[PDB]
């Protein structure tokens, strides 16, 4: 499986600075997450269709991170230094590895237009964000517009995002919000990003081949080199028997869960030896 440690699917996939999992995996049979991970969306906001992404990412047969729009070279007339106190690494304001915070440069935020033709022969998971400032001052300071837009279109996706500024309860010390979006770009398709402000540009995208049909397990059980056909939240099970009373929510070729304490079939004769 894919052990995420203290990270949630969101944290791992967005590239939360506390998530990395060193030289990473390229295939997994299921996902292992903790009952309550402590590292997710370090900068607050809404993750669109999150339970759907979680399900689609359960089992993956092929998986490669690629710098869809390289940070160091893609935005010459924008600032890409944008970091947050809420997204800290060690003792410093950092940001998500897979996304880029684009703000003004030399008093302007010029229009952007960046397309990507899927040359991977696999689905490409493209993730972006939309920043929603708490006040019009910040909106103007960062994007130099009050009439901002973010268009994102493919042959199977088309959404225009306008930022909505508002007084909000602080979450991780932010009044501001970043709403997370994704799409699984089909082999051979082009995706176009076009904005005049508020785009949290995709930096890294993922070429993948979606597996069979798996799920996520939330367990503090240790990981092991053992091989199974049936996995339970508390440990693996011997799948040769027709029934089990271990756990109702399993992943694999599993015996049917039953509430029973015993299910023993007599083969021999009544033992009556005295």
């Amino acid at each position, epitope marked *: 499986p894919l052990q995420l440690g203290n990270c949630s699917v969101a944290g791992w996939i967005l590239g939360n600075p506390e998530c990395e999992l060193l030289i990473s995996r390229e295939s997994w049979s299921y996902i292992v997450e903790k009952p309550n991970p402590e590292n997710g969306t370090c900068y607050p906001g809404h993750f669109a269709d999150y339970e759907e992404l979680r399900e689609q990412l359960s089992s993956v047969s092929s998986f490669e991170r690629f710098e869809i729009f390289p940070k160091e*070279s893609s935005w010459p007339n924008h600032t890409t230094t944008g970091v947050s106190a809420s997204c800290s690494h060690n003792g410093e304001s950092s940001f998500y590895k897979n996304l880029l915070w684009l703000t003004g440069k030399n008093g302007l935020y010029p229009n952007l237009s*960046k397309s990507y033709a899927n040359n991977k022969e696999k689905e490409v998971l493209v993730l972006w964000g939309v920043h929603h400032p708490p006040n019009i001052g910040d909106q103007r300071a960062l994007y130099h517009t009050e009439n901002a837009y973010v268009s994102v279109v493919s042959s199977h996706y088309s959404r225009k995002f306008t930022p909505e500024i508002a007084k909000r309860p602080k979450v991780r010390d932010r009044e501001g919000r970043i709403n997370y979006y994704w799409t699984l770009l089909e082999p051979g398709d082009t995706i176009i990003f076009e904005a005049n402000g508020n785009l949290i540009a995709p930096r890294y995208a993922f070429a993948l081949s979606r597996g069979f049909g798996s799920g996520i397990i939330n367990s503090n059980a240790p990981m092991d080199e053992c091989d199974a056909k049936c996995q339970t939240p508390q440990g693996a099970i011997n799948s040769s028997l027709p029934f089990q009373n271990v756990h109702p929510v399993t992943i694999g070729e599993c015996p049917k869960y039953v509430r029973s304490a015993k299910l023993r079939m007599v083969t021999g004769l009544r033992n009556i030896p005295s």
Partner: antibody, heavy 125, light 112 residues
Framework: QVQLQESGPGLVKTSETLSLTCTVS??????????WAWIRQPPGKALEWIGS???????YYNWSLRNRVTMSADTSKNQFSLKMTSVTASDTSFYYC?????????????????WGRGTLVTVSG | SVLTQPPSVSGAPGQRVSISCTGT?????????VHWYQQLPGTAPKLLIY???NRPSGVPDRFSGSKSGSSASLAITGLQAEDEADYYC????????????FGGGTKLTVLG
């Protein structure tokens, strides 16, 4: 190991539409590692990139031409094409077809190889 | 032409010529590799140098490439009459859509 050949030279009426086809030999156009190019050059002048197309029809275009050009690929005939609308005399050029080995497009490390002979397209009333 | 080339350079046979290709913050200055093409009278261009300093097969050790900062240079040592052609440098520009760009070209004249 691949050889490229542009369609025949000809005339295009002013304000009309220019069509060209390149034919790939010595290999398949259906290769994930190439983006097929159309370059042009007005006689005596410099080279200009028009666009590059993946076999699926996914393309990148020269910003200044983005709204006049369209490129496609035909994996059966092993050909890729160019369609340019509202032609001006400025569109009178040598039209070349080439190809690029591409890993990550926005890394910008790719060049052009396997160039064709070129085809003179003359724009006139 | 987003990349700037001297309209012309010349050299006597056996001398070293250097054709410069000077760019901006959005192309060479952004970290994009530089490639060169040789164009002989009335022929289609051909690749001469790829990935800043690499020579394809059939290109002699006389032809070399270098890139520093936001500028590149094609150098030809021990100039031969056969080298008399146009020379184009090519790179990439990320300012807008992410485009492939060419230099204006340089006509090399071999003397004597």
């Amino acid at each position: 190991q691949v050889q490229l050949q542009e369609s025949g030279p000809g005339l295009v009426k002013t304000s009309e539409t220019l069509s060209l086809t390149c034919t790939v030999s010595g290999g398949s156009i259906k290769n994930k590692d190439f983006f097929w190019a159309w370059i042009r050059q007005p006689p005596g002048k410099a080279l200009e990139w028009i666009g590059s197309v993946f076999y699926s029809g996914g393309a990148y275009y020269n910003w200044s031409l983005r709204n006049r050009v369209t490129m496609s690929a035909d994996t059966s005939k092993n050909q890729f094409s160019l369609k340019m609308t509202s032609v001006t005399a400025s569109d009178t050029s040598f039209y070349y077809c080439a190809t690029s080995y591409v890993d990550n497009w926005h890394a910008g490390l790719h060049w052009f190889d396997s160039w064709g002979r070129g085809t003179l397209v003359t724009v006139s009333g | 032409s987003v990349l700037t080339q001297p309209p012309s350079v010349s050299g006597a046979p056996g001398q070293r010529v250097s054709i410069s290709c000077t760019g901006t913050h959005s192309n060479i200055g952004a970290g994009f590799d530089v490639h060169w093409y040789q164009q002989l009278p009335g022929t289609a261009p051909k690749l001469l140098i790829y990935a800043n300093n690499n020579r394809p097969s059939g290109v002699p050790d006389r032809f070399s490439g270098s890139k520093s900062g936001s500028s590149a240079s094609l150098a030809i040592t021990g100039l031969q009459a056969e080298d008399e052609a146009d020379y184009y440098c090519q790179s990439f520009d990320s300012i807008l859509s992410g485009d492939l760009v060419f230099g204006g070209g340089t006509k090399l004249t071999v003397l004597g």
